[PDB]
Amino acid sequence: MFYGTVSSPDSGVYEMKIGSIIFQVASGDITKEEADVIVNSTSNSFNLKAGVSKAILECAGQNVERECSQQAQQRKNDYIITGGGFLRCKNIIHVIGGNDVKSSVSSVLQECEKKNYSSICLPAIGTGNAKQHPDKVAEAIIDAIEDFVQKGSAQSVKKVKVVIFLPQVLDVFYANMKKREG
Ligand SMILES: COCC(=O)Nc1cccc(NC(C)=O)c1
Ligand SMILES: [Cl-]
Numbered sequence: 001m002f003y004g005t006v007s008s009p010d011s012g013v014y015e016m017k018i019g020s021i022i023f024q025v026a027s028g029d030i031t032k033e034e035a036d037v038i039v040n041s042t043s044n045s046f047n048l049k050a051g052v053s054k055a056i057l058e059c060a061g062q063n064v065e066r067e068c069s070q071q072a073q074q075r076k077n078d079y080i081i082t083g084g085g086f087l088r089c090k091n092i093i094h095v096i097g098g099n100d101v102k103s104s105v106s107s108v109l110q111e112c113e114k115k116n117y118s119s120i121c122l123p124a125i126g127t128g129n130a131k132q133h134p135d136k137v138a139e140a141i142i143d144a145i146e147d148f149v150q151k152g153s154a155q156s157v158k159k160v161k162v163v164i165f166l167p168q169v170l171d172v173f174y175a176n177m178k179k180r181e182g
């Protein structure tokens with residue numbers, strides 16, 4: 001229906017088309033990535049400093065931490081959008097690691113279209129302190145992209161990359177891609 005073939009354009013990187021979007025996975029440090037949006041998997045108070053969130057908030061800087069607590073004390077947010085600070089992005093989207101991962105990724109995609117952005121980089125959302133299972137997280141991330149494509153919503157978004165802290169979790173994402181392959 002939408003899925004292309006799984007291949008490797010670089011050592012340790014795996015990709016496939018999902019409609020007009022190139023979907024990629026790799027292991028490494030997400031704070032070294034460049035993309036229009038980088039996603040942070042945080043807590044419901046937007047101030048977690050454990051797992052990948054520690055590295056993202058430290059590298060982003062204190063002006064970003066204050067955007068987070070200022071917005072947190074304004075309304076009940078499901079996610080928040082901040083500046084990039086010292087990360088190589090235009091915005092950070094902070095999602096709640098314990099929330100439904102398909103819902104969180106759908107919201108990220110919609111917000112990126114609203115800004116006419118082309119590239120997104122995210123971690124394996126919820127696999128840190130939220131302790132969601134890696135298989136369920138992989139299934140949810142890829143389902144969200146499939147649904148966005150199916151609805152004809154992808155216009156500006158062309159590349160979605162998951163940069164994963166543990167190589168063992170990358171293996172789970174690769175297997176999920178091969179299950180879907182066209
Ligand atoms: C030494 O461990 C540092 C670390 O980041 N661990 C770690 C381990 C497993 C998953 C995740 N992921 C997220 C989203 O936080 C992080
Ligand atoms: Cl998490």
Ligand SMILES: [Cl-]
Binds near residue numbers: 127165166
């Ligand atoms: Cl991760």
